[PDB]
């Protein structure tokens, strides 16, 4: 019979979380990767895409 003291969560190293966030922002700046995630950005000018 299922129990409530099954270990529901995990604890993650702080440095690895920061690493993952950093390496994830970098992937946001490569045109081919954004296209390969399913976004329809063929007509865009630049992929980092800053706005005023």
């Amino acid at each position: 019979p299922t129990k409530i003291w099954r270990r529901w969560g995990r604890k993650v190293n702080l440095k690895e979380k920061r690493y993952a966030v950093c390496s994830s922002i970098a992937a946001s700046g490569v045109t081919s990767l954004v296209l390969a995630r399913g976004h329809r950005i063929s007509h865009l000018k630049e992929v980092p895409l800053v706005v005023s």
């Binding site: 920061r18 690493y19 950093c22 390496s23």
Partner: protein
Amino acid sequence: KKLDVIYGKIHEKKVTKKNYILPKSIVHNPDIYRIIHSDKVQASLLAKKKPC
């Protein structure tokens, strides 16, 4: 612009992550085939050989 103050290129109190260093890569330039085609490398390669 906040993205350079958060990660410590420009320092600022209570905005920069304390003592955080931005991760480095085990590779300098991941373009392997530009290395393989260099004159230095090509001068060390050996004549192509035959199959059976």
